[PDB]
Each structure stands twice: as C-alpha cells, then as structure tokens.
Design a protein around this nucleic acid. Sequence first.
RNA 1: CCUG
RNA 2: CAGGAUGGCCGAGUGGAAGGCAAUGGACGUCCGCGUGGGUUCGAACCCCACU
Lengths: 827, 827
Amino acid sequence: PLVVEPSYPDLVINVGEVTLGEENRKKLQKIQRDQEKERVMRAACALLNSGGGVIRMAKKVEHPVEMGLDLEQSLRELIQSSDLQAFFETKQQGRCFYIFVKSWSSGPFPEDRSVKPRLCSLSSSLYRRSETSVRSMDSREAFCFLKTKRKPDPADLIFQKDYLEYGEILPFPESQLVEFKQFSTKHFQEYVKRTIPEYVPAFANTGGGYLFIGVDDKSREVLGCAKENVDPDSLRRKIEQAIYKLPCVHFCQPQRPITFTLKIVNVLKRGELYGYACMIRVNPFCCAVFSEAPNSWIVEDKYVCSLTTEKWVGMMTDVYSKKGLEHKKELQQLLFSVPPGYLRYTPESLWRDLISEHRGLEELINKQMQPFFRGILIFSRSWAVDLNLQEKPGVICDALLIAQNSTPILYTILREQDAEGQDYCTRTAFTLKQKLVNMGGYTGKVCVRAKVLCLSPVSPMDYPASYSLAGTQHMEALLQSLVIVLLGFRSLLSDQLGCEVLNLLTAQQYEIFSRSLRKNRELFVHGLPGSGKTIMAMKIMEKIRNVFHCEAHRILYVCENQPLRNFISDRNICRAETRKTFLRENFEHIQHIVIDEAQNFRTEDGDWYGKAKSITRRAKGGPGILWIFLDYFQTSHLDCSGLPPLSDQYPREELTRIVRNADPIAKYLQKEMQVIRSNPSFNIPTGCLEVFPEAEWSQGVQGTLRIKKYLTVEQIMTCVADTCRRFFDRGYSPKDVAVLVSTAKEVEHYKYELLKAMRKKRVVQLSDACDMLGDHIVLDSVRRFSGLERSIVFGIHPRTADPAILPNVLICLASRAKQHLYIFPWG
Amino acid sequence: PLVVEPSYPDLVINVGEVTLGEENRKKLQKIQRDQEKERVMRAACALLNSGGGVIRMAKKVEHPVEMGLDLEQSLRELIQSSDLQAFFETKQQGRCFYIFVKSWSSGPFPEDRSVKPRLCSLSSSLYRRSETSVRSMDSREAFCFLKTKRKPDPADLIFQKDYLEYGEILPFPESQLVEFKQFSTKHFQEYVKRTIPEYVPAFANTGGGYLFIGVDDKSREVLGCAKENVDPDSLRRKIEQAIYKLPCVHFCQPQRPITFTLKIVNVLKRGELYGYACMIRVNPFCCAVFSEAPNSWIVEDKYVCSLTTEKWVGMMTDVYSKKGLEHKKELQQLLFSVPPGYLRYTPESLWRDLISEHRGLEELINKQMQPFFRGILIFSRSWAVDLNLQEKPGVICDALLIAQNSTPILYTILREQDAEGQDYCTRTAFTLKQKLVNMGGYTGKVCVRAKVLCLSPVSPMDYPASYSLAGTQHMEALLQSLVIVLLGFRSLLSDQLGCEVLNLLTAQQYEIFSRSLRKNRELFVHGLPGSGKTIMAMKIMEKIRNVFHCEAHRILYVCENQPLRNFISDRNICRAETRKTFLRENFEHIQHIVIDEAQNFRTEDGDWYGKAKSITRRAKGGPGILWIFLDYFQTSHLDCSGLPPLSDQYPREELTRIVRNADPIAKYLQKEMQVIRSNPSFNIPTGCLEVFPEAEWSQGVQGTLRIKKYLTVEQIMTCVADTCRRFFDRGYSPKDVAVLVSTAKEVEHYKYELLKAMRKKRVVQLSDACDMLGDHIVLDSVRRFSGLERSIVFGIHPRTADPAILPNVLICLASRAKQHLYIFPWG
RNA sequence: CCUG
RNA sequence: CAGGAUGGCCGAGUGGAAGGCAAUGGACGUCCGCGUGGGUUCGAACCCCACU
Ligand SMILES: [Mg+2]
Ligand SMILES: [Mg+2]
Ligand SMILES: [Mg+2]
Ligand SMILES: [Mg+2]
Ligand SMILES: [Mn+2]
Ligand SMILES: [Mn+2]
Ligand SMILES: [Zn+2]
Ligand SMILES: [Zn+2]
C-alpha cells in the first residue's frame, strides 16, 4: 500500500521501486509499466488533493534519468494541461527520485470555485454518449456536467416490434441515440454483462438512447443469438441487475432509480425461431450515473485513501474566517508588513520578554539569522499551542521565519537538547504548512522547514528553487495566508488580528455613516451597545475639521464622565469638556458641538441642550454642527436627562451594527438587550428601544466569554490574577486589561484585594479609569468606564441600589470588552 | 476557398463532396481523407467563430451514414469537449448531409468572458515545453497562457565548449531545458529548417532551454553531421533565418526579437575534424512565440477567411446597450411578456393602424397564425429599417414571430408579388439572427426563418428540433436577447425600451432616496434638472401611506402650476392643491405635506412655509412629514419664493443623477447648467447652484437632440408637422409629443399656426397642458409644463422678457423631453 | 472490430 | 489475462513492402500509405497510446 512517511514536515509518500527513463521503461512489460504508473499516479493525485507534498521513489540506476513519456502524459492528464512545471517538479539524488507536487485547489473559498474543479482524479467514471462513441468526462467536463445537473424516431419504431426477421436491415445508422452490438455465440452473455456498464450510463447521462444487442455493426443486419445459447428470462434478470447495480447520485427529490425498458424479442428465420435479440431503451436520468466509483485519492490521517462516490460528488460540487479572508491584504500590511531591507522580529514585546528571561537567546537567534537579510521572524511561546497542538516543556519559544531567497522555516528553541524536540518541531511545521494551504488558501509552492535549536551549547529534503520566497509578492501572499490561518486559532497574533478586523469593520460603518455630515446640521445619533458610537463621534469631529476648515479648538465635545473626556481630550482633535464645565464656562467662539452619552446627562446644573442649540445656531457659516450621540440601552439613572421628547429627536441616524465586540460578546449583548426591552426605566421613552441589531450582521472575530458564578471574593481575585499572569506570559500587555466593579465606593476595597493577589504575580500597579495612556491595568466602576473599552475585561459582582437600574449594568459592562469577558456574579 | 451561400437567412457553407461513414472513409487514401476533414473543419471553425450556421456536404451515397470517427474526434478537439450535441447537430436527406453549428461565444460581453476563449481554432500554433516533450496548447491553454503573458545547469558546461569528440556521452538527460536531436541522414539544411520551428518556440514560450542537434536521443552520444554533408556558416545562416521567421506577438514595451545563442562546434574523431554539431540556447521570451500563424477561421462578408496572428491574438485576449444587458429580464417582462395560452400582437397601436390602412391584412395574418397557440408577434413598418438596413417600397410591414414549438420566423408582407421580396426578407432575417447572437448575446441554438406574404394573388432548410422554442425559458431568453438588440437601434420598440430603462433607473435612485423617510421629518430635497424630482415626490407619498398606515387623504401635495397639480391629482395617491388654494382653504385635517417646485412659489399670497410647518407639526402621530422638493436651476421668476434661507434648509437631500432624459438631452442639460453657474440668477440664494451632477453617471439611452436655428415660423411649423407625421407613421402615439412655446400669450397664435399645417397631416386634436391623458399633441408654454415629461418635445423660439431667465428657460424646456428634443431658437 |  | 488486422489473393516481414500466384497503393526525388487517428524517433508496417 501507499502510506505517508511521518518523519517529515510535509506529506511524503514513498511509492518504492520505480523504473525511470523512457529507454528503461520501454523494456518493461505492459503489466509492470502500468502498475508502476498507477502507483505514482495514486500518489500524485493524493498529493494534489491533500495540499501537496513529495513523492519519493527509489530508482534502480545511479545516473540522472528522465521521468518517462508515459508518466509525463499521465501527469498531464491529471492536471488537464501540458504545464507540468506549475504543479510537478522533480529532483533526484543518488538512488532517490523525488516529485514535488503542488496543491490543486487551496483553501475553503478559492477564487475559482465556479471555474475549476475541487479535485484531480485519475478517472471520474462518468461517461457520455458523444455521437456514435462513448467518452469519459475529464475533471473539467464532469465538473460542468454536475454543475448543470445540480440546478433545479425510427429506432423507437424498431423497438415497438415484438419480433424481428433474421438478416433484417435496420434503416438507420448508429447515432447519438442508437448503438448496435453483436457478440460471439459462446461469450454473448458475458459480453452483454460487460457491455451494460459502459453504454447504459452513457445514454442515461446524455439524453437516453437505444442499445440493440444482436445487430451487425457494419451491415446493420439483425442476427441475434441462437435460441439454444440464450434464455430470455435469465438474460432479462442479468441485464436488469447489471443496470440497477450502476452507482447513481441525485441532486433532487424524488430520488428515483434509473428508468429504462428492456425487451428480449424473437428472431425468426424462414418463419421459425432462430435466436434472441436484446434491446435496451434508456431514458435520460435526472442526475449523474457512474459506471463505478470514481478513481480519486486523498490523504487522511496517514493512509492514502480513495474517495467514495458520494464524497467525490460532494467535493466536486460544493475556524475558517471570512472577515480574515476579506481583509487579508490590509491585515497583512498592518501586522506582518514586510520591511524593505532588514529582518523584522515580531511581536517586539514578546521578543523583549524572551531575551530578558533567557541569557544568550539574543546571540543565538542573531547568529542563526545572519544569512537572511530581509524578511520577518514571528515569535511565540509555542506555535504548537498557537495551532491547537500540545505544548512541550523545555520549549523556550518557537519562531517562524519568512525571508527572501529562503523557504519558510519554523525554529524551535529548547533550553537543553532533547530527543522529542525534532519530532515536536516537525509536527508543528507540518501542521503550519497544511494550514497555510488548506485554510489560509495559499496557491503557491510552499514548504515549512522544521529546525530545532538548543540554547545550551534524517537529512533535510532539498526543495526545488521554486519553493524559495523570491521577493515581496511571494512573501506578502504567504503572510496573507498566515493572517487568514492565525485568525482561525486563539493566540496573541490572532487577537491582534481580531482587534484590527474590528477596527476595519468600524471604519466601514463610519464611511457609511459620515455621508450624513453634508446632509445635516442637527442630528440625533441613536447608537446600540457596541455600535462604535464614540469612534464615530471622534471620526466625525475630525471630518468636521477637515471639511469646514475650522481649527480644532473651535470644535467642542461634551460628555458626562471625566475618564471619557480625558480620553477624548488626549486625542487633540477638539476641545473636550464635561456637562458641568460646559454649563459653567463660556463657549461663544465655538461653532460646532458634539455631545455623547447624552442619555446619562442630568438637568440639575442647567439646560445644556438649549445652551448647545444657541451656541451652534449663532455660528457664522449658518448654524453649526450639533450632533448628540446617545444610547438608551446604556442609561445610568432614572432621572430626566434634559433631552427633547422622542418625537422631537430628529433628524436621526441609527448605528445598529455591532462592530466593537467579538462574536461571543456581541451575541451576549444581543440576548441581554431583550431584558431591557422587557423592562425599561421610566425616563426612557417607550418607542426608542424598538431599534434592533441587523440580523444579517456578524463580526467574524473570535472571543472569550466566561460566566463564573458561585465563587467568593478571594477566589474571584486569585482567578483574575492567574488569568492576567497567563495573558502576560502569552505576550499581552497590561494596558489591554481592565477590571470593572459595581460602584466607585467598592473600588478601593477591590483594589486592595486585587493587589493582595497581584503581588504574587509580579505586577503591582492598578490605575483608575482617568488614565489610559500608561501600560498598567485599569480598575474602576462600570459607570465610570462608560465610553471606554479594553480588550480583556473582568466583570465583578454587578450591584446597584434600585431594581429599575440594575438591568442596564450587564450591557454597560459587556459592551466595554472587545475580545475577552469574564463575569463574576453574585449567588 | 469556401464561400457562404447567399440565398439563406443563415450562414451556410457548402464544402462540396465529402465521403461519410466509417467504412467508406476507411477505404480512402490518407490524403483525400485528410483533405475532406480539413474542409469540414475549416467550415465548422468558421461557423463557430461567426455566430453559427450550417455546413452542407454532398454525400456520395443514398442511404443514411454516420459522420465518421475521425470527423467526430476533430469536432471534439475543436470544442475541447465530448459534448458535441451542444454545438453540432447533423441532418441528412437524399444526397445531402447538414451539420448545424451553434456559436461558440456570443455577445460583446459574454458571461464566460474571462474564463473561456472567444475563438475556436484548429491549432493555436503555440507550443510549450512539457518536461521532455513539446506540446501544442489548445484554445483554453493558449487563452490562459496569453493572459499570463499579457498581465504586467550541466548543459551550460557542454555549451561553453568549442569542440566535441565523436561518441562523447553527454552526462545529463533530456529535461524541461534540454533537447537532443540527431541530424537527418538525407537533407541536412532542410531538416534544420524543419526542426527549428518545432523546438525554438517551445523553449522561448516555456523558460528557455538548450537544443542539441547532433546528439543521439537514446545513448546521449555526440554524433554531429559529417563535414562534407553541411557547411557550418551556411547552416548558421539557415538556422538564424528560420528563427527570425517565427511569428511573435508582444504585449509589452519594447518589442524585442527572439533572443538566442547559436553555436556550431566541430565534432572531432580521434583528434581530427569529422563533423559539426549545432547548439541553440533559447532564452525565455517576454511574450508569445508562434511557430506559424494560428489555424483559425471566420466568415468575413461572403468569404471564409483565416485570422492573422495579430487578429487571432486580439480576439483571444479580449451600438451595445450596457443597461439593456443589465435589465434585459425586467425589460423583457415589461414589453415582451409572453402570455400563457394565446398569441400576442405588439405593438397594438401599430397593429391597429396597419389593419385599418390595409384591407385583408388582419385576415392574412390571422390565417398564417393559426398553427401557433402561444407566443408574441412583433410588428414593424420595416424591420429592415429597424435593423439599419435599406427600406423596400411595397413592403406593408414586417412581423417577427416568437412562438412555442417553433423557430423564430420573420414575415414580410407585400402588397403585390415581387421578385426582390424574398431576397429582402432573407437579408433581414439573416441580419436579425446574426444580431440576436453576436449583439444580443444569445447562447442557445437560434435560427430566423424568412417568409414573404402577399395581399394579392431554393426551399428553406429544416432545422433540428432543438432549434424550436420549447417553452417559456427559451422564449424569454430569446426575447431578452431581442431587447438588447433593439436597444442598439433607433426604432419604435427601441424607444419604448429606452423609456422603460429610464423608469428602471429612476426606481433605483428612488430606492436609494427613500431610506430617508424613517430618518427625517422635515427635509429639503434639492434636485437637479432631470433628476426625477416629481417621480420621487409621487413615489415617496406612496411610501408614506404604507409606512404611516394612514389613508391617502391625510397626505397633501402642493405645487405652483395647475397642469402639474392635475397630473398629480389624477393618480389618486394623495390630495394635491396649488399654493394659492393652499394659502386659503382649510387643511388642518392633513398630517403630511409634500411641496414640489417650491422655488416657483410666491410670497404675496401668504406664509405657505409657515402654514405647512404648523399643519404638519400638530399631527397626532407626532410631527408629520414635511418634505419640500425644489430645483434652483429651474427658477421661473426673480421674486421671493417664501422658502427659509439656504442656511436653514436642513436636513437636506440631493438628487444629482439625471434619470429622466436620454443621453444627448442630459448632456445638453449639463452644458446649460454650466451657463447658469457661470451667470446665476440673483434671486437664488448664494450657494445653491454649487451642486454638481454625478460626473460618471450615464443612462445609456439613445435620444434625439436637434437645434434648427435661423428658421421662420412657417418653416418651423411645417417641420413640426412633418416630423410628427413621420413619428406617427412609425407608430408613436400623439401623446408622446409636446410643443412648447416661450410664453403663454403665444399659445393660441401657435395653436392656429400649428393646425394650419397639421390638418394636412390627418390629425385634428390639440390640447392644453391641463389634459395629459388625452391622446393629443400638447401645445403649451414652458412655464405651464414645468414638472411634466413627454418623449418628443418641440421647443419653439425660447426667450425671456427679463434677460436673466434666458438660460433658465432653456433648461426648463430641455428637461421636459425624455428622448427626442427639437429646438427652434431665435434668428 | 475479431479470436482464444 | 492473452493473440490478431499487410498490397488484387495467400502470406514474409517487429527500428536502416519478400516470394508465389514487365508491371501490379497514391499525391506532388520528397511525402503519405501495412485496421483508423495520433505520438516518439534522424528513420516506424515494426515501438507507445487511443479508438474500431
Ligand atoms: Mg492476407
Ligand atoms: Mg506478419
Ligand atoms: Mg495506419
Ligand atoms: Mg511511413
Ligand atoms: Mn456498435
Ligand atoms: Mn528528443
Ligand atoms: Zn435525481
Ligand atoms: Zn514582449
């Protein structure tokens, strides 16, 4: 049999002894030549259908030889092209001959999904009547045939007869619908058995036709087979069983069997019976009829296996991340930008951590990277875990090199030499390559070379020169496939990519939303939880500056909360102030005003709404911009806010698509908003909450949502410390974490008890929400964090004085977390 | 040389006497068999590349015969498939054998435009190196190869030597870069000439390589050619000339020749000169190299012609109605809807006119149409003129039948029998079929039969059954192709299709525009001329009814002009009134108000804007909708309108895309809008006209723009009556025509002056603008017609009493015409 | 297509 | 799974059109032709492939 050799970072099939050279292969018998050809073609088909690999065959001579014309032609028939170089490249060393196979189709969503077939095959086993001949459908023909089937006569005059005269001349030739057959007397019955499988499917697949057995092909005479040698009823049984044995597939209901008419008619000579003529009429079949199982091969687990008929049809007709697929080029430019003239190390934070922790690692890597002038080196604690494999103790780190004039190399750094190290690195490189093709959709020639290194002071297969990354185009295509693969697993780089995907989604929505600036002066923007409301507000202020040509200090932003204004003010895109500062101080020189989280405002201090109306109207270039962002789902008190009635808040723009939280958090927000819909506060006008998230919208970003009820305070706080330490080990920064509690009065207690457990985990700085620019964790209340967001958020013990306010708290909490959310409720 | 038979409504190629049957073609000499095959294949390739047709062969025998397996296989190679049935169908009667060919690729923009090649070929003459063999690229391979080219070693050790030894073994085998060839024993220079085109193109197309002439293919021994047999310098000259004779096509700058190094090296024998060896190193070539001109054929005029290298490459590497193609399904369902169970005559106005004019025409057509139980019969004065051909006097009408269970038939009706009648009908049917395929992009099997009929007292081919329209899908696909064909010619149905295209464009822009109904309550809609402002106003009231669930009478429409008020009222979508009626009567029962042409309102009667606000913002379901449609380019007077200041007119929508006038009219509108902007009216607020139309927006609808300056009143009126009579003869209704005058005081004068000429033309009814439903030519002033549209507009002597309005009046005139605009300015 |  | 198909007929020829019952396939010394169509070869009846 054929089995993949496991010691390699690639699929490598050993086919054994093969005779190579056309002169040598001409001296073989037909049987042995065909058997060696079949082994090699099974291997090449399997590697084409499974992401590529290497065929290894032992050659019986020492000197370089050519492949042989018959093997060449079989490879050409496999790829349906004379361009062998595109998929097959051969090397030979000593007594070893290697063929390097590229994948046929790469990824779940190739560009050519409707253009080229999913699989290569040795044969499709689909036959078509092609005028007077029967021909087998190549992969492209069969692809088109099934793609068509999936969508939602004088001969009959002869067939109607109940007897035939011996020597009768039929008045029609063989044609698209007619086929005449004659057989020798002794073998007639076995010849019929072998005939049915090749002509019945061809008629069924094409439009039907008549198969006349007992008619001379050339003269069209009726001859039949002698009575003594044929039993009509046994013949009928045999033919019918052969016909029903044919494998049929369906794309419809009802899935009825092949329909045909079988007639065994009498052949009369001089008025006496001589023999029997068999006539089959084959109606056109609704779907595809195979003569047998297709001859297509794939690698699964470790065995080269043959696809079944149904699996083959499924593949020939029909976590993957489409947001990654769509944004791959932008994401690659952001994270894995290829430097022009030096080797880049990423992530820089993880690299610095590793070099600080381990002595001599810097020198080791620098010495190992001398040959590679340009490219990128991507580090990790364990690429194995990054790919959902098992971790190996003793692995300092893994690094993936993607440099010019080199193949991809996966380095594994060990503290001390190990026997299992090379196996671990090989498994990791093999998985990485298979993902780069089968998930990342890479269509080039790719290999990952596994290389173990030891910090304490089988040969590698040589690939053709076409497997080396020759420059920017290849490196960028491979890094975009790497982006798409990383977005399918949980890891530091997959989390950075997910954050950038969220940013790109927000930018799309903002481009849709910013077209209203030229159309409005007064606007009430009703956002939903996690709709980017604040990001739109900032980008709108920038757009106002650019369009109206007014200086930044002429644009004003008003919010309820000090942390939020602090955050907005540090942008230097406008003047930012609070409701109280706004109501107190004078702003006559201000032309444009933006107001956010207005539903949290209060009427105690004064009529901020009227003040802003006046300030904006008295602007010189007509009335200025007065945009009031608000979200009633995130209300923070039962009092009135000073907003005009719901019927007065016009014109309106609604931000309904969730673009700021990953998929789990978004689903949680969607579910939880129904509680607020069920019981809203009385300060909320009734009809406002009848805004619903877009049903067709998803973020396509992975995240973590964990509910950890039934725990005590010290357990919560130790768990938080453990999780933060794990993230910091994986490479996250503290400035990606925030801890949110019910009220600002409990902030001091929870800070103390968090530092009590953090002093065991090597970070001793917790900051309030009023500072967000330093590299430290943020602890604060849910409410004081309104308008801010962090990648990882710890939600501790929701609590408020009034039931009428409690329902909001879960939404106002979960909406603060971009990717990872941990909830610790009371119980 | 082959020629098209001209007596047919199709492309028919008569290839002469052909031997058919496998048993008959097996008895031939190979030369005769191959010559017959070449003739048939040239015909088939030409018909594939030229829209399809028929090949006629004369078969030497009386009885039915299969085509022959070599002919079948050549057709399979031609279409690169075994599905011959899709393109080739064969019939035979007596001593005639027909092959009906379907077009390979049809239409200017096929669905498969970028995936399948435009041409079928007998040979591409493009060769690629495939390991150790040279292979010709089929059509699909050559298509992909040319796309790739269009988008923007141990052998060298031997090659470096300057002498070799007889019997030397070259230490490397043949490979993708190396070819071993022996010299011929007989004719050496001729052999080298023969072999250079076989190998130099393949190396040049596939990365270069080495060709060693004089090296045994099997033993790899150096043999060379005897010294006395060839002369090295003449051999070099012959090789270089053969190389430079190779056709090449470039897709790049510069267009450099083929690059190579040619070496003739002495072949010693025991240290003495015995012979010569030829070494060619062929460098990779930037573009395609042909061994000879491609073997592809096409029907040009009356000749079957071969395509040149450059014509073939252009065809392979790459009026028409884009909007027709985009909306063909909707346009077909509007105009050419095919009913279930009865034959439909269209256009019915033209049909009625024809039967009224001619005695017995109804009887003739109804008699002819008995056989057909379903379909559509499309009449015309002259389908030949519709298709840009020449008219034939004596032709009553042409009808195009498209009925179930029948092929298309073009009928020509003559008053009296004529010899040229059948020729005229055949030429028209040929043009129609070729257009349906090559221009309308029909991909099925199509033939248009040509029949002549008379009102007073070569046999057509019989097409396969697949050429008859089986049912709804075939009839609809064909009618959708006819839609695209018609939209490229100037005719009555083409003008109706253009009107419906403008309606589809308006509906799309309205789908964009109507999203503001949820988001605004007060809206100022600023439309440009021809931007469909009134259509939006009507359709948005239709939407207000559905979205506010109120009855129609709750909506109020207010405009300036009585004709427009009437046109709106007669639709029963709302209550419609005038500004003057509005400012007097009671309307507080109203919830919603839409104001149109508000720029033309006047202040002297009252505060209409104040009344509108007051009525709307006191409705029960909150403030009502108050949308105001205005167009500052279409200002009719220089006084005050009563609108709020431009700085106040928010929120604001803009309709900047012209969707109501054909392309010439729209361009003329833009050119006049430029004049307005250059010299704006003073009563308009300052920044209004800085609205600009969509730069790239086009309607793709053909129209008529004619300016007949320096005419007299008599000439103008006679020309108007003459053009009206021409249109009415062609089939346009009177109610497609409007005659517009500069001022209303001239209306009765010009009514008299018009009837004075029109009574010669057999129509007696004119109408004022206040009746747009009557089937009459509307004569009225530009001012009174503002807000109304008609297909044909006659603009007479436009002018203003106050100079500023001079270009505004021209714009308000032009914008009224949908398709045909005739202007008669001042002398 | 024929024969074992 | 093997073995076949040659000129008028019988039959010899597996890589440089016998013989037998003056010639006794053809197109224009080159080429095609040994069931048909292709391929390799400097060279094919001869080797390879498909088809009948
Ligand atoms: Mg014989
Ligand atoms: Mg023999
Ligand atoms: Mg032959
Ligand atoms: Mg020969
Ligand atoms: Mn048969
Ligand atoms: Mn060779
Ligand atoms: Zn079915
Ligand atoms: Zn070039």
